[PDB]
Design a protein around this ligand. Sequence first.
Ligand code: NA
Lengths: 101, 102
Amino acid sequence: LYFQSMHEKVVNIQKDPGESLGMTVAGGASHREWDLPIYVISVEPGGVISRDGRIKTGDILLNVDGVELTEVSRSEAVALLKRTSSSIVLKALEVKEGSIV
Amino acid sequence: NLYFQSMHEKVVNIQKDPGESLGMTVAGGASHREWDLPIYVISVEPGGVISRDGRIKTGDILLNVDGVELTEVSRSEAVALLKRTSSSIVLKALEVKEGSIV
Ligand code: NA
């Protein structure tokens, strides 16, 4: 039996403008062999993302402020995440379960 | 000021008992909307084969098992390759070493 469970979240975060999100992201479509997701690879303890609690290391970022991240470059995705703003809407994916091997 | 990232491949030859599992859990190998999730390591069982070996980590994307490129086979075939009864398994994985802080 193959199990897998997905939870796609809409995460509304209010912050100070010029406050960073406090997470580290990697992935995207920059390289020849891959169109990878944008992964959250670290979260800074006590930062915006950390205090919010909904997005954690291992989650995938799907959409930032209405823009689906498949439609823009990794550079542009980072640009969207870095936009000066006091609120940001992120859609993220949390994957659970899997096949034990 | 810099928003650099880096990812690196690694080849891991593991010797094990034919009766023992790898001691990890894999997910992905399926699409979500317009996203194709690669097969990756979602969990590692403390003290199992993969844990004791120490080279493959949670989050590693699995590229190739025993010569078979996983993008070229079904998800279930990927899982079957990993579960093969054998005393040695060769894995090629892709690890994100560095990302962009936002
Ligand atoms: Na690409």
